[PDB]
């Protein structure tokens, strides 16, 4: 298993199961849904018949009147107040096993090299935080919408990719499934591969 670079063709080898396992679609889908579910804020609340600002007085008599039987004006079948099963601020994040999360990331990375979307390079660093020269850089290697992942997160590259919409800079420990899927291409520097190999194992 060899990861060939773009220019110097220095042959880097990694573990077999990390970048060559079968693509378990069910395993990936659960983690992707769970990652989206954990980003849900879940800040919402309606009012029940016990929380609507109003009186607990019976509107009219139980019998005698020709009207329907009513006990409170806050009833959900009434106007100006209702909602029987009112929502509460809840948590939508769901638990993911360590081996399931790591197993899904290895299957995601294994499909990336099968779709030749993973481009490994020896180094990735800009001399100045200017976004013009960063936009000059990836255009020469014919990339427009990529995920810039490096082993060491430098502020010189963090500032240059802050304004460009289609690129994102992250730290090697801070990888997630959804950005490895949403972005078209993903680029590796040399030392990030050796750091993501051991964190997945």
């Amino acid at each position: 298993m060899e990861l060939v670079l773009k220019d110097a063709q220095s042959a880097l080898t990694v573990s077999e199961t990390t970048f060559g396992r079968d693509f378990n679609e069910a395993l990936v889908h659960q983690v992707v849904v769970a990652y989206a579910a954990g980003a849900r804020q879940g800040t919402r609340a309606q009012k029940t018949r016990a929380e609507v600002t109003g009186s607990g007085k019976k509107p009219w008599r139980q019998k005698g009147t020709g009207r329907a039987r009513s006990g409170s004006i806050k009833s959900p079948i009434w106007r100006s107040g209702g909602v029987t099963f009112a929502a509460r601020p809840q948590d939508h994040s769901q638990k993911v096993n360590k081996k399931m999360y790591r197993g899904a990331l290895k299957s995601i990375l294994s499909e990336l090299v099968r779709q030749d979307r993973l481009i490994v390079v020896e180094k990735f660093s800009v001399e100045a935080p200017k976004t013009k020269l960063l936009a000059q850089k990836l255009k020469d290697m014919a990339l427009e919408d990529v995920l810039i992942i490096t082993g060491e997160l430098d502020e010189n590259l963090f500032l240059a990719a802050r304004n460009l919409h289609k690129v994102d800079v992250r730290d090697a420990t801070g990888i997630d499934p959804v950005s490895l899927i949403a972005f078209d291409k993903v680029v590796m520097t040399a030392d990030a591969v050796k750091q993501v190999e051991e964190m997945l194992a």
Binding site: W60, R61, G64, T65, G66, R67
Partner: peptide, 15 residues
Amino acid sequence: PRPRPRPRPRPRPRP
């Protein structure tokens, strides 16, 4: 909106 005087009740019997 007011109700009604209700129909005048008849003298109730017993066993």
